[PDB]
Structure formats: structure tokens, C-alpha cells
Design a protein around this ligand. Structure first.
Ligand SMILES: NC(=O)C1=CN([C@@H]2O[C@H](COP(=O)(O)OP(=O)(O)OC[C@H]3O[C@@H](n4cnc5c(N)ncnc54)[C@H](O)[C@@H]3O)[C@@H](O)[C@H]2O)C=CC1
Ligand SMILES: Cc1cc2nc3c(=O)[nH]c(=O)nc-3n(C[C@H](O)[C@H](O)[C@H](O)COP(=O)(O)O)c2cc1C
Ligand code: SF4
Ligand code: SF4
Ligand code: SF4
Ligand code: SF4
Ligand code: FES
Ligand code: FES
Ligand SMILES: [Mg+2]
Lengths: 217, 230, 433, 59, 43
């Protein structure tokens, strides 16, 4: 589908260069640590980590934060604009407290991700582009979060919830809005990508060090 | 010397190391079709109009970015090169707006001329076209970004020649757009050259808008007196 | 009996990733108990030439999906230094639909990846290793960071790595939601704080890479098997699988199977054996199978008539007009709308294009629109050949292989299910008068 | 199909159809058309001069 | 020895700053970075 969000910034009272943003001293220490991970003369390599840290501190990315990152890294603001508008994990508009991302790619689609999307829709009463009136949940559609084996799966604030049934995701939503912390992972009684059939492989105890080592080493 | 030997349609050419396929072709008097390549800007390699076939090579190469190897035979008018040019021009014209009568670039448009020379004569695109919003970058350069072909010539000129890093691209895919992402004026003493470098009518002269057509103007070569540069 | 003709049924002791399911301690102590970091100092002291020779004898091909010979690729960094530093880049972006192996390698066997990074960096003379992981894998990246900290404290990496006298650093760099950033040049751009747009080759990363320095980009699975290959030797790895298809492989089986899972199996195991052995078989029985995408969304699908006798290696699947890819098997039964699935894949590719070059940027969106119309049936039969020609134009005329990965599924669908498209068009024409 | 006296047409809203593209001037075998243009007060592409010399015209 | 239990649970208590705190901690173990000779490509 066509991307709803625009790629031109128009100043608003909520979002304009005079919007107050700054990094906390702990965040400045983290920025120093991040910058020391690249060779001298290549400070611009830290644009993505520092921008992500700004988003993690603020929740989203106002243009003031992007200008601040450009100023800290001595990078022209247009390059930071390019980075922020290229990568989809950056939020250039405010999002809810829990950003719900449902994978609808073909491997997840085959395992009825439509049921999960509809269950979330009828539990929250919002669409796949809206935010709840209490500003708690934002629901969007994403592409292949990397857990195709555990389809259908959903990501909520860098946490994975997979092997989902509509009732399971509704319960997760209830305990999320109740202030609890839901345990990330599959909900079907399997811990990880192992087969649910009974662990067809890797049954024997793992071999000790140097077991298969060749001679002359 | 240090020159190597290459062939352009079987004709021996002696070129320096690091010479591209396009330069070797122009040494024998052929101009490879190009949109994104400018000899005074950095090499981009994005428009893909310059794709050409090397003999005994299954895949066509980008003549603007590929250094030519010794013994290579560049086949500039083979079936592979012509079909690659036709496909690239088709993809370029799929979303282009039907603005030629109202475009100032009409009659001196590289897109028009290279469509007439290297592309097909009809369309098989049956979908709707994309439309983008315009950007205000000053009172000198008129901006109609629907005609943009995403060559990035303007960005490279602003970065390298004018020394101003205000131009760039936002988004990705079919939604990638050329602009400033904010209301900002590209006001520089050399800012007017982006109109010339732009192959299409996306960037045009605002004082000159709508007044004339290229074929009716008479050309007088003269010297500028606004400074001491001449 | 040399020259094996039947492949599969791999034993546990021959497996490399002995903690694929996270059933053991992923920390340093568990990895050491499982054989990791065992006389790796002796491996480093053997020199880059010995490691490169072992990798070449192993016959390992790139596990990222292209199957390039690992030894030949790594030998490109065996040049004398010209003043610039040398770097190793580990590709953990893992963008293909259907692929889940690298996530498990990172989350459950991180010390394996760290030791492989050290061994490969010593082999190619790299000063440090940058691990580029997708930003969606936050917990996986934090586990990797914990493992790297454990290795640093134990003296396994850093100054005087493992006592060998070779200095090596391991860095973790996180991207922000970009499937194109898995491509090696696009990944290099993403590391340097720029847009994830691929670079034209030449120059190759061995000449000009990250920060303009000689660089090698290698998949997580390719890196994590090198220490075990060097420990047991090239010959042991070589025996498994067909000739030029040596070693073990991680397989992700998803879609319409009873037990979708990630399993480790020998290379040339037949697809039917793998599906009926580890995945629990096709939902509704084997006779209910309609089509299989063997190597992730970029590889073309094959119908049931091909899946019952094909082998899961590069050459066998190439002979089947498809590719091994990332060994990501996606299974679809006869209840699946085959056109809708391919349309969803094309939508994925349309949303993942970086837009740098004309053929991908416009043609992929064009094919997305055409296939969206195809799903409803609004088009005409000549548009099938039109779409085939459009795909041909996109293929081989783009900067990177994302155009290839968008074109190939369309070609496979047109090749194997043209009557379905024609029938849907005829139904639309009937219903809409 | 009969060719008679020349005329300039309008859109149903009354807007001029002519957009000063100067194709007729270029194609005119007798050079009977003279066109000048500029942006209108509302920014529209319109003509300020559009003359046809009917004694030069060949119809 | 038993394979029944899942032993990857330390990631359930991870916070927003875990990765960057780990980077800060690791910053003292790293080697002096190489230098290109200038402060920036625009210098
Ligand atoms: N694991 C994943 O998440 C994904 C994997 N893929 C796979 O990636 C494959 C295409 O990737 P490519 O890099 O474009 O394939 P490629 O053949 O062009 O390159 C593969 C590796 O070999 C190197 N190489 C290739 N030719 C070389 C040469 N002549 N000289 C020196 N080095 C050379 C390349 O630098 C690269 O590192 C696809 O087949 C796809 O299956 C695609 C998307 C995602
Ligand atoms: C669009 C695109 C995306 C890719 N994404 C990944 C990826 O996420 N992970 C990966 O290992 N390789 C990916 N690749 C393939 C890389 O080129 C490959 O991993 C790299 O060359 C490493 O080579 P190796 O297989 O020898 O390790 C991608 C290729 C393309 C064209
Ligand atoms: S830019 Fe060229 S092709 Fe496009 S409308 Fe203007 S004259 Fe026509
Ligand atoms: S405005 Fe002109 S030069 Fe700039 S990207 Fe568009 S077509 Fe190219
Ligand atoms: S093929 Fe697509 S993703 Fe690859 S460089 Fe071209 S536009 Fe970008
Ligand atoms: S200038 Fe001539 S051809 Fe162009 S719109 Fe006006 S009348 Fe028609
Ligand atoms: S298809 Fe859902 S995680 Fe990839
Ligand atoms: S002129 Fe070579 S790709 Fe544009
Ligand atoms: Mg122009």
C-alpha cells in the first residue's frame, strides 16, 4: 500500500526548530562512547546510533532533535534529514506508548496474520494507521520482522510476541494496558524455533571441547 | 607508454588506465546516452541509461562508472545495448507527466531527444502516474518536481561545486523525492547552474518562464562584463 | 564406500550449532563447555595462509545466499597493507522472508560468532570486526554485546587476543529497519552514517570498502562455521553434501507445515525428506502440496512435480530453475491463493526498494500494480507476456540484486501457474460483463 | 473536415485552451503565426500575442 | 543434564538503554582507533 506519511516537513507549534530538545548528561556520555567506536575523521558514522538514542530518549524525533544530532556530529542537517526519512524505524511523528507492529508478509500471511490484525483492531477499536485516544497504542503493518518460523508474530517496543492466536494477542494487550510486562516469546508452549513435534534434532548431549579436533593443532 | 588497447566496435583505441567505457567510446566520436553522468560532477551510476554490452560478457555494464579493461570490445550498437536503452527509457517515461506543451524544457530536453533516438515509439504502461508536491527554493529556480527523474545532478552540483549541502533525497523507493525537506532557499552565487545541469524541466529559470522556445532563439556568443572574470 | 549418493540424516555430533534451540547456556561458560574457544590461539598462530587454505579445502560457499566460494573471496584481502586499516563486516541484517537462522545463531550461539569473527579477521588481516545487525533484533544484539563483553574480560579479544599477540576488536552496529541494508555495499553505506543505497562494483570491498578501507562482508553463518572448520579441518566439512556443495546448512521451514522450525541438516538432502522429517510434513498431507519457495522470497517457486525429487543445494536447485538462496523453505498447500502470495512478495519488494536506480525504482512499483490487478483478474492475457518482458528489463540492468529478487518470483509464477492467471482473468471478464 | 477561417477556442468554463506551447508557430509552413507569452497574473501559461497573417496563410 | 529447560531468559529484563550501557562499558576495552589525518572530509 501507499505510504501514508509524507516526506516534507512543515513547521507546526508542536514540531518546529524552537521545540525544546537536548540530551541528558548520561545520554551525552553514551554519545561519547558511540563516537569513540569509529576512526578519527569519520564522525558521521555515528548518525544512526545517535539519532536512535535521541528517539529512545524522546519517544519520537522532532526536527529539533535531528538538528541537535547534526550539530553534535558536525554534519549538515540535510544528511540527518536523509537518514531520518530513509529508515522506517525512526518516528517523525509522535507514537503511542506501545507501538504494535504486526508482520503481514507472505510467510506470516500464510499463518493467518489477518486474524491477529482483526483481533487487535476489534480489541482497540482503531485501524492500522491510527492511535488510541488515550495515546497508549499505535498499530501499523511491517514487513518480515525476522521470525517467519514463529508466524504469526507481533513486535511491541523491541519485544517479540509470536505463535499468536487472537485470544493470546488480546490477553497481551490487556496485560499491557494493565501496566504489566508481558514475557516476549512464543505463546504455544514452545520456547523457540524448535519443532513442536518433540525436538527431532539435537537430542544427544553436546560434545566436549577438542572432540573432533584434527592432529597438528 | 602506459596506454592500454581497447576496441570500440572492433576499432583499436589506446587509452590511459582508469579510462571509463564512455570516455573510450567518445574518443572514437560516439556519445553514449546518459542522464545522471556529468563530466564535471562525481560519478553516480543511477540512471542506468548508459548500459552497454561488452563482447563475451553476459551482463551489460554502466559505461559511465566502469573502467575499460585491456582487450575489451565495446559493442555500442548491438541488440543488447539497444534493448537495454529501450527498457531504461520505458522505466523513465512510465511515471513522467504529460507536460511537454507546458514545460519550458520542450525542444531542448535530453529526455525528449534520447527518447526519440534510443527509446521505443509507444507506451504499454496502463496504470496511474505518481504526482509529487513542489518545493520553494527561491525566486530564481522554478521547481516542478513531478518532472524529476531522480538523476541527482543537482545534489552533486550543490555539494561539490557550490559547496552547499542543502539539497538531498528523502524517502525511498518510488516515493524518493529531491528537495530540502524543509522550506529553505537555495540562494548561492552559483545557484542558477542547477537549471542548466538538470536534464528535464523539473528545474527551470523563473525569470525566463514561458517566454520563448529553444528553436526560435538566435545564439550570439559574447563575453560577460558583470565582473572581471570575463 | 566413498562418493556418497544419498545425503541427509545428519547425526548430532556432526552438527555445528549444537545450541540452536537455546537449550543450553549461551554465555561463555556454556560455549566453552560445548567446544568453543578451544585452542583458538593455536589456530591464530598458524597464520592467515593456513586458515585460508583450510577454508578453501573446506569448499565452503557463502551462506548469505549467493554461494560464492568463501576461501577465494577471503583470499582477496591477503594483499600487503597500503597504509589503510583492514576491516571485517559480519552481515546480520537477515532480510529475506522465511529466513530465521541468523537470529538463532546470534541469540543462542553468540560466542561462536565472536570466535569466527576473530578467526576470519586474523585470516584476512582485519584490524577489527563490525557486526551489522538489524534494529528489530534488540534482544539479540544485547545478548551479542554481553557475549562480546565476556570475551573481552576473558582476554579472548582485544589487545593480545587469546595470547596470540594479534589485536582485534569486535563492534556491534545497529541499523534501523531497512531490508536493502543487508546488501554488502548498502550495508557499508549504512555503517558510515549514510542512506542504505548500494554502491556500484567495481571497486569491490576488498579494494574500497567501509571508510574507504579494504573490507570483507560475510554472513553470520559463514563466519560462525569457520572456527569449527579450522578445528576439525577442511576435509571433514568437505565430505558432507555433493561435490562443490560441501558442508552443513541451516534450514528454515515455514508456511503450510505442521511443525515450522529451524533445523540443521546436510546440504544435498532432498526437499521432501527435509519437509517430512523435521517440519512434520505438509499440512493436509504431501498430496496437498501446491508449491514451495525453496530459498526465500528472491528465489522462484517450484510446483509439486519438482519438489518430490529435488535436492537442497545450489546446483540441483539451479537445475530446477530456482536457487538455494538462504535455504528458507516456504511451503504452500492447495488451499493457498498462489497469485496473492506472490503479489504480497512483490509488495514487500516495492516497499523495500531504496529507489536509487531507475529499473528497480519504477519497474518494481509497475510490477506491483500489475500483479495487484492480476490478483483481482482485471487484466488481459497479453499482459502476462508484458509483465514477463518488464521483469526481463529490470533483471540485470540494476545496481544491486534487489531487482533480481523482485523479478524472479514473477518469472516463476508466470512459468508455473499461467493457467491460474488466465482462468482468473476469464472469471473477471465473465462476472463484470 | 472543411478548413475555413481560424478561431481560438475555450474550455467549457470559459478558460482559454491555448497554453502558448508554440507548436502551431513551429509547424506553420508559411510562418503565418506570431506568438509571445508570459506568466499571467495568476501564474498561468498564456499568450500575450497570437497573430495569424491571413495573407501569408495557406489554410 | 537435561534439555527440558529453556536457558535464554536473561533478555526478559532488558531495558531501553541496555545496548548503549553495554557499549559504554565496552568502550574501555577497545584499541586506539585509526585516524585519516583530518577531522572530517570537509576539513
Ligand atoms: N540472507 C538474507 O537475508 C538475504 C539473502 N539474499 C541473497 O543474496 C544473493 C545476491 O547477493 P549478491 O551479493 O548480489 O551476489 P554476488 O554474487 O554478486 O556476491 C556474493 C559475494 O561474493 C562477492 N563477489 C561476487 N563476485 C565477485 C567478484 N567477481 N570479485 C570479487 N568478489 C565477488 C561479492 O562481493 C559478495 O560478497 C541473492 O541470491 C539472495 O539469495 C538476498 C536478500 C536477503
Ligand atoms: C537486497 C539484498 C539484501 C541482502 N540482505 C542480506 C542480509 O540481510 N544478510 C546477508 O547475510 N546477506 C544479504 N544479502 C547478500 C549479501 O550480498 C551477502 O550476504 C554478502 O555478499 C556476504 O557474502 P557471503 O554469503 O559469502 O557471506 C543481501 C543481498 C541483497 C541484494
Ligand atoms: S521535462 Fe522534457 S519530457 Fe518532461 S514534460 Fe518537460 S519537455 Fe516533456
Ligand atoms: S531536479 Fe533535475 S537534476 Fe535534480 S534529481 Fe531531479 S531531474 Fe535530476
Ligand atoms: S535495484 Fe532497487 S534497491 Fe538496488 S540499488 Fe537499484 S533502486 Fe536501490
Ligand atoms: S501555441 Fe498554438 S499549438 Fe500551442 S496551444 Fe496555443 S494554439 Fe495550440
Ligand atoms: S514473514 Fe513475518 S517475520 Fe518474516
Ligand atoms: S550515465 Fe551511467 S548510469 Fe547514468
Ligand atoms: Mg532543466
Amino acid at each position: 500500500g501507499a505510504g501514508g506519511a509524507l516526506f516534507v516537513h512543515r513547521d507546526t507549534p508542536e514540531n518546529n526548530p524552537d521545540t525544546p530538545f537536548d540530551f541528558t548528561p548520561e545520554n551525552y556520555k553514551r554519545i561519547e562512547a558511540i563516537v569513540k567506536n569509529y576512526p578519527e575523521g569519520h564522525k558521521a558514522a555515528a548518525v544512526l546510533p545517535v539519532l536512535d538514542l535521541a528517539q529512545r530518549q524522546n519517544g519520537w524525533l522532532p526536527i529539533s532533535a535531528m538538528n541537535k544530532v547534526a550539530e553534535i556530529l558536525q554534519v549538515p542537517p540535510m544528511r540527518v534529514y536523509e537518514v531520518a526519512t530513509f529508515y522506517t524505524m525512526y518516528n517523525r511523528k509522535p507514537v503511542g506508548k506501545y507501538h504494535i507492529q504486526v508482520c503481514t508478509t507472505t510467510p506470516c500471511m500464510l499463518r493467518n496474520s489477518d486474524s491477529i490484525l482483526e483481533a487487535i483492531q476489534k480489541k482497540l477499536g482503531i485501524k492500522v494507521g491510527e492511535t488510541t485516544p488515550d495515546k497508549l497504542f499505535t498499530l501499523i503493518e511491517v514487513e518480515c520482522l525476522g521470525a517467519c518460523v514463529n508466524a504469526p508474530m507481533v513486535q511491541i517496543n523491541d519485544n517479540y510476541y509470536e505463535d499468536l492466536t487472537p485470544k493470546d494477542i488480546e490477553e497481551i494487550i490487556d496485560e499491557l494496558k494493565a501496566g504489566k510486562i508481558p514475557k516476549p516469546g512464543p505463546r504455544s508452549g514452545r520456547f523457540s524455533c524448535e519443532p513442536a513435534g518433540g525436538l527431532t534434532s539435537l537430542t544427544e548431549p553436546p560434545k566436549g571441547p577438542g572432540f573432533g579436533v584434527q592432529a597438528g593443532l | 607508454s602506459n596506454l592500454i588497447e581497447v576496441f570500440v566496435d572492433g576499432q583499436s583505441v589506446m587509452v590511459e588506465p582508469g579510462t571509463t567505457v564512455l570516455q573510450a567510446c567518445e574518443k572514437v566520436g560516439m556519445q553514449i546516452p546518459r542522464f545522471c553522468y556529468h563530466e564535471r560532477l562525481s560519478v553516480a551510476g543511477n540512471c542506468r541509461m548508459c548500459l552497454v554490452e561488452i563482447e563475451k560478457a553476459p551482463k551489460v555494464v554502466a559505461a559511465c562508472a566502469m573502467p575499460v579493461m585491456k582487450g575489451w570490445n565495446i559493442l555500442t550498437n548491438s541488440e543488447k545495448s539497444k534493448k537495454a536503452r529501450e527498457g531504461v527509457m520505458e522505466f523513465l517515461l512510465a511515471n513522467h507527466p504529460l507536460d511537454c506543451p507546458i514545460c519550458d524544457q520542450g525542444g531542448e530536453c535530453d529526455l525528449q531527444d534520447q527518447s526519440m533516438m534510443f527509446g521505443s515509439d509507444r507506451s504499454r504502461f496502463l496504470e496511474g502516474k505518481r504526482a509529487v508536491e513542489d518545493k520553494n527554493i527561491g525566486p530564481l529556480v522554478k521547481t516542478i518536481m513531478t518532472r524529476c527523474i531522480q538523476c541527482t545532478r543537482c545534489i552533486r552540483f550543490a555539494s561539490e561545486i557550490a559547496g552547499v549541502d542543502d539539497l538531498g533525497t528523502t524517502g525511498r523507493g518510488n516515493d524518493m523525492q529531491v528537495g530540502t525537506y524543509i522550506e529553505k532557499m537555495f540562494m548561492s552565487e552559483l545557484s542558477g547552474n542547477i537549471i542548466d545541469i538538470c536534464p528535464v524541466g523539473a528545474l527551470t529559470s523563473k525569470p525566463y518562464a514561458f517566454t520563448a522556445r529553444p528553436w526560435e532563439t538566435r545564439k550570439t556568443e559574447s563575453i560577460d562584463v558583470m565582473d572581471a572574470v570575463g | 564406500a566413498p562418493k556418497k549418493t544419498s545425503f541427509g540424516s545428519l547425526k548430532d555430533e556432526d552438527r555445528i550449532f549444537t545450541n540452536l534451540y537455546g537449550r543450553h547456556d549461551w554465555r561463555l561458560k556454556g560455549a566453552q563447555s560445548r567446544g568453543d574457544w578451544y585452542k583458538t590461539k593455536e589456530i591464530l598462530l598458524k597464520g592467515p595462509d593456513w586458515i585460508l587454505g583450510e577454508v578453501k579445502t573446506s569448499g565452503l560457499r557463502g551462506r548469505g545466499g549467493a554461494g560464492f566460494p568463501t576461501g577465494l573471496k577471503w583470499s582477496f584481502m591477503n594483499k600487503p597493507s597500503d597504509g589503510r586499516p583492514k576491516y571485517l563486516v559480519v552481515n546480520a541484517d537477515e532480510g529475506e522472508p522465511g529466513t530465521c537462522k541468523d537470529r538463532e545463531i546470534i541469540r543462542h550461539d553468540p560466542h561462536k560468532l565472536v570466535e569466527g569473527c576473530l578467526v576470519g579477521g586474523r585470516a584476512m588481516g582485519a584490524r577489527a570486526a563490525y557486526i551489522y545487525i538489524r534494529g528489530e533484533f534488540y534482544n539479540e544484539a544485547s545478548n551479542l554485546q554481553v557475549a562480546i563483553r565476556e570475551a573481552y574480560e576473558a582476554g579472548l579479544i582485544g589487545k593480545n587476543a587469546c595470547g596470540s599477540g594479534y589485536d582485534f576488536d569486535v563492534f556491534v552496529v545497529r541499523g534501523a529497519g531497512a531490508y536493502i541494508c543487508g546488501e554488502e555495499t548498502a550495508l557499508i553505506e549504512s555503517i558510515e552514517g549514510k542512506q542504505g543505497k548500494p554502491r556500484l562494483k567495481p571497486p569491490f570491498p576488498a579494494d574500497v570498502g567501509v571508510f574507504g578501507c579494504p573490507t570483507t562482508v560475510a554472513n553470520v553463518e559463514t563466519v560462525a562455521v569457520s572456527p569449527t572448520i579450522c578445528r576439525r579441518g577442511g576435509a571433514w566439512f568437505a565430505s558432507f553434501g555433493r561435490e562443490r556443495n560441501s558442508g552443513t546448512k541451516l534450514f528454515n521451514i515455514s508456511g503450510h507445515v505442521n511443525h515450522p522450525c529451524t533445523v540443521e541438516e546436510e546440504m544435498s538432502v532432498p526437499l521432501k525428506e527435509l519437509i517430512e522429517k523435521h517440519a512434520g510434513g505438509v499440512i493436509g498431507g504431501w498430496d496437498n502440496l501446491l508449491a514451495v519457495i525453496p530459498g526465500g522470497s528472491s528465489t522462484p517457486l517450484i510446483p509439486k512435480s519438482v519438489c518430490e525429487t529435488v535436492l537442497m543445494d545450489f546446483d540441483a536447485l539451479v537445475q530446477a530453475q530456482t536457487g538455494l538462496g538462504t535455504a528458507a523453505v516456504i511451503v504452500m498447500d492447495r488451499s493457498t491463493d498462489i497469485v496473492k502470495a506472490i503479489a504480497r512478495l512483490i509488495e514487500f519488494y516495492k516497499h523495500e526498494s531504496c529507489g536509487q536506480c531507475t529499473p528497480c525504482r519504477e519497474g518494481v512499483d509497475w510490477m506491483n500494480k500489475v500483479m495487484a490487478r492480476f490478483v483481482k483478474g482485471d487484466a488481459r492475457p497479453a499482459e502476462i507476456d508484458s509483465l514477463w518482458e518488464i521483469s526481463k528489463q529490470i533483471e540485470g540492468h540494476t545496481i544491486c540484486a534487489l531487482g533480481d529478487g523482485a523479478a524472479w518470483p514473477v518469472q516463476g509464477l508466470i512459468r508455473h501457474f499461467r493457467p491460474e492467471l488466465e482462468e482468473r482473468m476469464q472469471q473477471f471478464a465473465l462476472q463484470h460483463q | 473536415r472543411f478548413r475555413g477561417e481560424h478561431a481560438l477556442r475555450r474550455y467549457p468554463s470559459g478558460e482559454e485552451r491555448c497554453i502558448a506551447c508554440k507548436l502551431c508557430e513551429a509547424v506553420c509552413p508559411a510562418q503565418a503565426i506570431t506568438i509571445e507569452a508570459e506568466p499571467r497574473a495568476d501564474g498561468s501559461r498564456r499568450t500575450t500575442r497570437y497573430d495569424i497573417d491571413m495573407t501569408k496563410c495557406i489554410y | 543434564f537435561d534439555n527440558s529447560t529453556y536457558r535464554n531468559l536473561q533478555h526478559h529484563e532488558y531495558s531501553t538503554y541496555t545496548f548503549l550501557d553495554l557499549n559504554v562499558e565496552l568502550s574501555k576495552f577497545r584499541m586506539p582507533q585509526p585516524s585519516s589525518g583530518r577531522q572530517s572530509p570537509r576539513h
